Ligand binder design. Sequence first.
Ligand SMILES: Cc1nnc(N2CCCCC2)s1
Ligand SMILES: Cc1nnc(N2CCCCC2)s1
Ligand SMILES: Cc1nnc(N2CCCCC2)s1
Ligand SMILES: Cc1nnc(N2CCCCC2)s1
Lengths: 244, 178
Amino acid sequence: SMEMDEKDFAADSWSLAVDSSFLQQHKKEVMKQQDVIYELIQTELHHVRTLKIMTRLFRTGMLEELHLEPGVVQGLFPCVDELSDIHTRFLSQLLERRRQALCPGSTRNFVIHRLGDLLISQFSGPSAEQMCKTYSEFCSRHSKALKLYKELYARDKRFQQFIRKVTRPAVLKRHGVQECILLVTQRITKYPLLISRILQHSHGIEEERQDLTTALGLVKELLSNVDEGIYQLEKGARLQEIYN
Amino acid sequence: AIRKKLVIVGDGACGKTCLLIVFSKDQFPEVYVPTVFENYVADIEVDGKQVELALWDTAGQEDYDRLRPLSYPDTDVILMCFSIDSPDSLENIPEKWTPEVKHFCPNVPIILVGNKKDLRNDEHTRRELAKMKQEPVKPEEGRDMANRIGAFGYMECSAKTKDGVREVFEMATRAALQ
Ligand SMILES: Cc1nnc(N2CCCCC2)s1
Ligand SMILES: Cc1nnc(N2CCCCC2)s1
Ligand SMILES: Cc1nnc(N2CCCCC2)s1
Ligand SMILES: Cc1nnc(N2CCCCC2)s1
């Protein structure tokens, strides 16, 4: 993550991120809606950061320091570049919506009134098809990635030294290889919980309540499709085991 | 410190997210209660042993039967939650959650946890439940269910007041070490 975005999302809530004199100008319902929108963007920034740890720290670090057999790094980090592209673009749109909403003379005071349209765009058309295809592949390769990791850590000294070295900093405490994989798999099922709570505080403008209701429906359709398209791959599985 | 993994399971309104948030946060959430929980690695010292306990939630995965089991690999202890204000959340424990956890986490200890214990003596809760011929879950109903499902043990807590929360995670660490 970059310092500017980390500081903008360092507070525990939108009510603590904005100046108190700006907070005082709004109704309680607006504050409750903005606190949940802030949580969606803050957790998206963290999710993009988890993907950057996987691509730049682990994946690239293994290619540049270790002599792993071809096809092993891809097996440990399936679809990480595609996932990074999807979420960095989505994060870019969320942060631009916040940036355009800033009051002149402020880098922290804003209110996002029109999130629904951005969510419909993200969870419809080609971007939704790409999310569906990418998560169906990622989640089907999740178990294989964990088993490959466990094998390499237990049998390769240079791999074990590399993992212990790059995961030693306190800021990486929650972000070991296996932890990153589960954080990514769990990200998609957080979206309906956040959107439902935003919708609960977005009844003031009927166009907005309708847009968030449409977005919630699209997210649930995406999740249902991903869940139906998953079958765990197993290294060394035979055709007979598969078709039975 | 040895690393152990904890996963909490239970119905959507069982209070599992709130329980992980209150345990993990340095200060109780007085301004905003988060909608979701990402993960956390707690430093716990129980009975002279130091453990790094990784915490995970299954909230959001209740309707997705192929995504949900991806949370289970290498789990060391399961917290199986129900809400004391929801007798229906206790009824789904033996029929759905127990056979699922026993299948994906064989031999892993399960602690059955009765959440929101503060609602047992809440007049609004008692009024609402009485309209459906129901009452808050009794302590003996929780213990009996835990005994029936072969749980390592039965515990109660309140995320709202913090009572019993530390004890639940310290016992989960002891179970993970056995
Ligand atoms: C603390 C919380 N307060 N409300 C939450 N919602 C979860 C998603 C659905 C709407 C209700 S979480
Ligand atoms: C309930 C609350 N919701 N927002 C609050 N703010 C004003 C006082 C200081 C903390 C931020 S209190
Ligand atoms: C989701 C789930 N997938 N399979 C489950 N089992 C329940 C117990 C018997 C074997 C099948 S639960
Ligand atoms: C964290 C928290 N878990 N429960 C809380 N109570 C106060 C607000 C309403 C629900 C009950 S705060």
